[PDB]
Ligand binder design. Sequence first.
Ligand SMILES: C[C@@H](Oc1ccc(Oc2ccc(Cl)cc2Cl)cc1)C(=O)O
Ligand SMILES: C[C@@H](Oc1ccc(Oc2ccc(Cl)cc2Cl)cc1)C(=O)O
Lengths: 698, 695
Amino acid sequence: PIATPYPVKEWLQPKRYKAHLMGTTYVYDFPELFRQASSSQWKNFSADVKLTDDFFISNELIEDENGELTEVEREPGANAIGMVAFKITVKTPEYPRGRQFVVVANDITFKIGSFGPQEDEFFNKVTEYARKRGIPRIYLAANSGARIGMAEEIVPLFQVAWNDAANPDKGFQYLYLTSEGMETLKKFDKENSVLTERTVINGEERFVIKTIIGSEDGLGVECLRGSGLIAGATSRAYHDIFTITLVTCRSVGIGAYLVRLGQRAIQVEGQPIILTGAPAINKMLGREVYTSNLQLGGTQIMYNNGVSHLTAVDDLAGVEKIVEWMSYVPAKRNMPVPILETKDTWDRPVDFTPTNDETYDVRWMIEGRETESGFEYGLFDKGSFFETLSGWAKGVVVGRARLGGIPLGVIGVETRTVENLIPADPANPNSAETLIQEPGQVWHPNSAFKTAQAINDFNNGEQLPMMILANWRGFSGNEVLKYGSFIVDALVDYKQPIIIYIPPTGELRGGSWVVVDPTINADQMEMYADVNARAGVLEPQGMVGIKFRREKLLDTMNRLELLPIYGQISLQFADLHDRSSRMVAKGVISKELEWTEARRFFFWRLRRRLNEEYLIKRLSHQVGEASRLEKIARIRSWYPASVDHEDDRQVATWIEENYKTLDDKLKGLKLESFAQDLAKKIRSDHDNAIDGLSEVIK
Amino acid sequence: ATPYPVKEWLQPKRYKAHLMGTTYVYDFPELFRQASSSQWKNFSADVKLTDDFFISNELIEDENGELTEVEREPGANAIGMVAFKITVKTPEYPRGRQFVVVANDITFKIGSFGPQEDEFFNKVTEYARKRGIPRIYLAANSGARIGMAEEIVPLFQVAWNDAANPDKGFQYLYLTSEGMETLKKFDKENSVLTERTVINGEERFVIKTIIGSEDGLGVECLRGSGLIAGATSRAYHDIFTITLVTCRSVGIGAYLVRLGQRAIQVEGQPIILTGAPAINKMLGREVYTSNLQLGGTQIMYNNGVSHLTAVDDLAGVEKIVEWMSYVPAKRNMPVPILETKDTWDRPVDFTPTNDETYDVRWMIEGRETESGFEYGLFDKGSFFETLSGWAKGVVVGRARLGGIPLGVIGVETRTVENLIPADPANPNSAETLIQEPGQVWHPNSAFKTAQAINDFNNGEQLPMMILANWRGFSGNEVLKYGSFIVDALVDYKQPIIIYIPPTGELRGGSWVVVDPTINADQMEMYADVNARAGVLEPQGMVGIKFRREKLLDTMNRELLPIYGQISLQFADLHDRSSRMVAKGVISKELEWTEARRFFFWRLRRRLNEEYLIKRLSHQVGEASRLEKIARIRSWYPASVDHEDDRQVATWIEENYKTLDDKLKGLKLESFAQDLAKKIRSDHDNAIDGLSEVIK
Ligand SMILES: C[C@@H](Oc1ccc(Oc2ccc(Cl)cc2Cl)cc1)C(=O)O
Ligand SMILES: C[C@@H](Oc1ccc(Oc2ccc(Cl)cc2Cl)cc1)C(=O)O
């Protein structure tokens, strides 16, 4: 454009234009998008808030001469490699004083954002940078995969020693180099560019090419090593810090791999996630099977399969989802989860209530429900429910929510039936659509997998507490065995409080109960049942057909056709066994609750548990054989005698008032152990031991 | 009576178990005795065993509920679950190895899991885990025990509506002042939760909840199921776990075979979540005739849940014992070395050729030929394949290298005819014959590969070799499972060897999932001189950096056909192991024929160095793995070539006890070095403790 109000950004830096032509945001413009999203964050939390410019800081990161990452301020487009990173520092509602994270991204304008050894090495450095600091790592993927290429400085030299020079059609023997060809290389210092041997044929002194290496780096296997390196780096990152990646422009090969390795992924519509391009897949098979890469890695495929947790209409939408997602996550590894009080106070009843009659959306029980006669509040803070993996295995609902300001992961069960449709396969004319009915409250391979993925995703990086509104009465698919197994493993590994709650009108039968029982992880799990909930190995019908058969159904029909009404009797006899009262009597749940009062009970129970967990975790690197079980008992023996250990609000309150003081008792607890240990060491090797102490003078 | 004197009280127990199609619980230890004896026979026919080579002591809880060995009469179990502590002398552990066998007693309440069975099982699992010994589970059960208050059955009343004739309906269930009292004389008064409600002269106790006096009716059984499901999950990561499905395994029973991962299914014995009769009552028509269509070996062995299949119980027990022969006697002990006739010093005979099909197993274990026997890479007769009925594109099993046990993963070059049967649940759907090309990763082969790596790593604690030979991938799913492989590599705690074999290739994404840098602490890459590797293969590489123009440009030498081959070659000259060495992506290129020799000493050397590193586990202070190996190697004599595997291994084995003395010194060093740093970080605190300690 000629003569515009302000400078033409796309002209000052043509790369910005090239990026837009690619249909994605120019890399150096992303920090700005995070500013806008953070600003929006505030505008939704408290509109009367006036942000200044120093509320958001973005410092590009590059490697210095020693290869160490350092902050710099240069002009966009100065990057010498196709990978860049920024260290962001933002003041946010949950972290007013500020929080940090790293943003690594491919520069789609630098060799089509390909991964070369330097890009790989940079990405690895940045990832390690974030991990050492316990800081989140955001990856913006816009690439073309591993960089490729041959040694061009060898194309105008290699000679072809044919069988008979006068018969090229008869084939050839091998490729060699002349004495002149060798001199060309020696002139460019590119001597060790190829491996060769000297052989004199019919007179001339030849140099057979054994192997072609190349002076240019990033031609083959070194790109593969680099890819393996960052793949491993990302696998580790996921277990260390919060990871998430946004696909803004295609993401290919190692690019797609990283998307999955970081687990949490948001896909912008139209930007495919592919291992290999459709063109390549065509040439291979036979004819033109696929018309677009969107048929291979498009949203309708990755979001539907669960690779993509969320979809975004554009780059800004994606960044906004990243930021909203981060608002439930600790500023950094091992910090308490970020409390964020909203207008919706903890002290209120739960309005929306399920009815054995009318069908409902679990989300209503979760986040509340908007109606004509007004809004009906749900179990968690209004507007705090952030659903993820919503395009996959809809039989189960997954997301983050807030309880009186306390963030946590929530897993619910969709009661309505799902109509998972699967498009035909382009690589087989003999195949049509396939509508699959997925019954509610039943566990299918996908539901189980999604359930396991959620637990692991709440646990790793996010380090959140969790509540599962357990309401399953079966399983039918036999891979289910494998994925169900993933659930137990996921729970065994959970490190923050877990709450399992069978809601009103809900039930948990046989296998369904098994996979979520508190004993799987007694260190963190507690189970509760609504007074209007049902639970048992078998449902009434099943129990009847085994313990109340026509045989005995007659004996009672005597002491008192009339089969139907007597069938309804047997059912009630059974159903009277599946009550929460029996659950309390048998000791399988911590408590039976009343739905309307659950928001109040859980807020304090969870708050109390988070406070206690925090004290326990202070004894992690304690010396000795002390068990978690013995650690809480000890800590709890500290509470004032007049404090009721079963009064959640009271225990939470006292702890919150004595942090510093408790740290002291904790410190003194480890000190006793360190001494008791040194004692047992001397009383197990007095010789070398005693001498050791002596070796310690000053 | 009978020819020989046998326990009379067992007859009916045995009969019932057999009626179920399984061996009687107490006769199982005998099968283990036979398999072990048979183990010695195959190893050294000229061996005479004394009964003391095998001991089996039943395990039961004492007064304090603690598990103790007992010498009691068989068939005396008061619960439907039993266990044995077995001590046996085996070829790999001549002085003896131990493990526990936990099993359902199919004759005790049809092998259902009740609270007591559950807690016992859990206690036995924990018993093994605390000792680091293998836990074998023999499944023969009916799932969670189920019940109902049978005492409330005879004495419960109905309160009908406007019906002196029930036909209309009822309002609730109640108890009479007498029935209520009946429970009082039986002491089963708290078997219900009622409310006093005198209506029409007569008082009725409304039934609000039925508890029952018999333990093990509902949810208490579910808690128990959850307890052992989790206990098994932990065991799998702690000790060697394996399960033999010797009869039906239902619900929690089925779940357990999975949770323990390694599983052997006896033919005709199904692993199911819920029976067929049950499923039919949830679909309308009679769709399933038998549970075998739900959990038979055709399902579970093909799906990957069952690692192996067995014709009968004893075959299963033999497979378990055979499997165990590759595993340490207990957690963290060195892998069991078992040298046989086939020693390490010999070249590898069998060699794959470009123009000829081959079974990767020939490369692994060797092949029988009319002229004799072509030895493969590993010890003749040592290959033990598992998960052979699922994802045939990848080959996994245990093997021995000059006596050293390890996990092996190879790539099936021949295509696979995957036949997926049609489920009766949908008549509209018939069977299909999926086509799986070799050297191509698919969702299932990727999944199987990750499982293999994790199963070699957890419990087995085995080193591993992957004869990487993949190119493309097709079947989305691939993405998720491919990532499982990386996670498994990252988690691997023993030496790993990635080796691209002769005629083998590794391209693009296939290289990245097995690159050494994923876990530099344990991985090493090797490429045969006749191997190939690059991002793309010649075909595609040319279709990007050598098109019509460049191809027609390099005419300084209309003959498209012949020149097309010249370009491909120009490319192929890049994919050489020599470049791989030049670029530094492999530790070195090797010659197939000498691989056995080379790998034997490299592994032996690595195993030795690992052991030395492990001795610095509890070493206080914080030193990186690379920091410990560096100091360990600084101890080698200055004349030892750190690159000479045999020499390094030889010196170490000659100095175990010496290195051990030096090893301790390095600990006591840090011991005080730590106390010092303590004071130099909290002087006040330290002094008080130092003083208080000196007393
Ligand atoms: C009460 C029930 O026990 C179980 C326990 C685990 C079961 O396995 C699963 C449970 C849940 C899921 Cl999602 C998957 C599986 Cl394989 C099935 C039944 C039984 O014994 O019948
Ligand atoms: C070199 C190659 O990089 C990769 C990396 C990972 C890839 O994804 C996988 C490869 C193998 C497996 Cl088993 C799984 C995945 Cl997800 C694909 C290509 C590329 O960039 O094309």
